[PDB]
Amino acid sequence: QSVGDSIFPSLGQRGLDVQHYDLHLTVPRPGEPHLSGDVTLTVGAREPLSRIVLDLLGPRVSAAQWNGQRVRWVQTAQKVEVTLPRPLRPGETGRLRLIYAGTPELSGLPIRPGWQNEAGLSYSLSEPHGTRGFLPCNDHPSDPATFTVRVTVPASASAAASGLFTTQTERNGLKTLTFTQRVPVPTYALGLIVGPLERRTAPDVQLGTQTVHRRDIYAAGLPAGTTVPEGETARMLRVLSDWFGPYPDEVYGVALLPVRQLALETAGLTTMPATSNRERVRLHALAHQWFGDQVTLADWADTWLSEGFATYAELLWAESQGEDGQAMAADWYARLSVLPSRPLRATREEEIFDASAYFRGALALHALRLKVGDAAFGQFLHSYVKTFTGRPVSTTALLTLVKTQLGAEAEQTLRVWVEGRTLPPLPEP
Ligand SMILES: N[C@@H](Cc1ccc(O)cc1)C(=O)O
Ligand code: NA
Ligand SMILES: [Zn+2]
């Protein structure tokens, strides 16, 4: 039935491949949760599907169509179930349109994820499973998709979503802005912010033959000194892309909010509360554009593949800026040595964003790197991103790739960090 996630066993639909969300979201009063939505999903299937089953938590569906025709549907508990006129089979696609309105609901986690409302702002901060609050979706990272979003807001407000901004139209005191996310990312990586905000472009960044556009969002009311330092994002894109491969998206920037919250690596536009706005955090979120947004999780138990890689990116950045990488690893280790440890595959919701997922995962990569040397390690990161582009990653699959690409000894080095209940000793040269 569901995707069968080991942590969130009810989310998603087994076999469903949502390929594109075409969302028209209308927010009448930014900062208050009520909203209305009109979305068309382009869906395929990995196995014959007799129904399309989507996650939805709060809003109520009022109408549904399949390929532009009337269709049988029911909203039950936390799902919308659409009965198809005949099975959707692999290689076919159909267009599921849903009209809905109401109040998104917020879901051991670091935050209560979903559609946030505070201080005249409404915005998605939905990792892991909050997007279903404001968007009927297959809400699981194993099924990324592209997004086209039209956001309608009062004329006095503005909006920003993941994807290149094209047009803004206005009538009867309402503005509609269109954003196009052209590379597929998980549902929670869809950035979407409405309220008093301004879009500010910066010069394109050249990464060899690749061009990366630049823009940041500045919400009104930011603390004095809330900035994106000039030249920094270009330097980071160069350092990380030289380690990981081409930047996966068409644009990058941050959306700075005057709120007090964790930063989230929403696609091409990181949602950045000002309280988290630090150089290392900006690097970390940019690293997620590869590790989490492009390379997506098959199962929420494997969050260390996102958080541990993004954390290790901080050490690569530090070294690129002349700092001592081994000292940073020792800092990570000192932090863990007085905390409980766990194998890296999580078994409980409380664990998926705990210290082990970030810092034990990063030290696992440090151990691997020290085993194989920097040339092999960088080649491996390139191969890893390629191997798991279009294919959700797992801890088992990573170990297989290390074994085949780097050999049995390297796999054993990583496995000691992946498995085992006690914290291994600090990896040293
Ligand atoms: N992904 C964030 C942590 C986070 C998790 C869930 C959220 O809803 C928000 C933020 C990080 O990189 O640290
Ligand atoms: Na998909
Ligand atoms: Zn992270």
Half-sphere exposure of 217 toward its Cβ, with a 13 Å CA cutoff?
31
Ligand nearest to the CA of 124: 1
**Alpha-carbon distance 302 to 182, whole Å?**
26
Would you say the CB of residue 393 lies under 6 angstroms from ligand 1?
no
CA distances from 172 to 153, 198, 384 (A): 11, 21, 50
Q: Specify the residue for token string 């892991």.
A: 128
Residue whose CA lies nearest to ligand 1 atom number 4? 264
Residue of 312, 353, 356, 358 with the most ligand 1 atoms within 8 Å of its CB, for mutation: 353
| CA-307 nearest atom, ligand 1 | 12
* 78, 55 Cβ separation under 8 angstroms: yes
Q: Which of 254, 267, 20 is nearest to 137 (CA)?
A: 20
**293 alpha carbon to ligand 2 midpoint, in Å?**
12
Atom index in ligand 1 nearest the CA of residue 292 equals 1
Nearest of 390, 384, 388 to residue 365 by alpha carbon = 384
- Which ligand lies nearest to the CA atom of residue 44 in the structure? 2
Dihedral, 96, 97, 103, 104 alpha carbons, nearest 10:
30
280: nearest Cα among 236, 249, 344, 226: 236
β partners of residue 205: 212
Break the chain into its structural domains and give their ranges: 1-197, 198-429
HSE of 221, CA atoms in CB hemisphere, 13 A: 11
Q: Which residues pair with 160 in a beta bridge?
A: 193
By the 8 A CB rule, do 30 and 165 touch? no
In short, whether 283's Cβ falls inside 6 Å of ligand 1 is no
State the Cα angle at 207 between 206 and 210, rounded to 5°. 85
Sign of CA dihedral 309, 310, 311, 315: positive
Cβ-based neighbours of 135, under 8 Å, separated by 6 or more: 21, 23, 25, 37, 39, 56, 187, 190
Q: Is the CB of 125 under 6 A from ligand 1?
A: yes
Record the tokens describing residue 289, joined without a space.
Answer: 């554009």
Nearest CA owner, ligand 1 atom 7: 127
Q: Would you say 130 and 55 are in contact if contact means Cβ atoms under 8 Å apart?
A: no
Max CA-CA distance within the chain?
Answer: 67
At 380 the three-state DSSP class reads: helix
List the one residue out of 290, 242, 301, 296 whose CA is nearest residue 268.
290
Residue 108 Cβ contacting ligand 1 at under 6 Å: no
* 3-class state of residue 135 by DSSP: coil
Measuring CA to CA, how many Å separate 181 from each of 133, 142, 164, 237, 281?
20, 18, 7, 19, 23
d(CA 56, CA 62): 13
> From the CB of 99, is ligand 1 less than 6 Å away?
no
Closest ligand relative to 185 C-alpha: 2
Task: Write a three-state SS string for 60-128.
Answer: EEEEEEECCEECEEEEECCEEEEEEEEEECCCCCEEEEEEEEECCCCCCCCCCCEEEEECCEEEEECCC
Q: What are phi and psi of 220, to 5 degrees?
A: -65, 155
Distance, in Å, from the CA atom of 111 to the CA atom of 125, rounded to the nearest integer, reads 9
Distance 286 CA to ligand 3 centre (A): 9
Compute CA 124 distance to the chain's CA centroid, rounded to the nearest angstrom.
11
CB of 106 sitting under 6 A from ligand 1: no
- The H or E element containing residue 232 is helix 232-244
Q: How far apart are the first and last CA of the chain?
A: 48
